[PDB]
């Protein structure tokens, strides 16, 4: 259910080589909050990969601490998938967390590396979140 304390979800970005603005994945509910993958080009140059939590809510009282593994799937060999871990207290003023320079853009879009296929790149997030505060009283 949506009250699950953890989950793994993915978001495949299409026409990746042409990405110019930030893209957001549909929500994946964990601890009954909407979590989303955020991808954006940073400085061509590098891939911005962030995890966002409850960004739409106009509430300023919520907070949820979570740890997560951010991974860019390598379709040819999952052991080659690249991932970084994060730990962060999400709240309205810091509703997303990740790396502006998660991977070199030239590496991810290199057709010989196994991360891109038909100009599509798959991102994955494994998030483990504690019970939230200031949401369900």
């Amino acid at each position: 259910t949506s009250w699950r304390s953890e989950a793994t979800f993915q978001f495949t970005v299409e026409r990746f080589s042409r990405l110019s603005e930030s893209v957001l994945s549909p929500p994946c509910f964990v601890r009954n909050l909407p979590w989303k993958i955020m991808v954006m080009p940073r400085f061509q140059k590098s891939v911005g990969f962030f995890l966002q939590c409850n960004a739409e809510s106009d509430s300023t009282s919520w907070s949820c601490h979570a740890q997560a593994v951010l991974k860019i799937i390598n379709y040819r060999d999952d052991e080659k998938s690249f991932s970084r871990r994060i730990s962060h207290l999400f709240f309205h003023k810091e509703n997303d967390w990740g790396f502006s320079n998660f991977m070199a853009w030239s590496e991810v879009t290199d057709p010989e590396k196994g991360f891109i296929d038909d100009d599509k790149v798959t991102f994955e997030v494994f998030v483990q979140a504690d019970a939230p505060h200031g949401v369900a009283w």
Partner: peptide
């Protein structure tokens, strides 16, 4: 190190 997107 990690951080926010903005």
């Amino acid at each position: 190190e990690p951080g926010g997107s903005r």
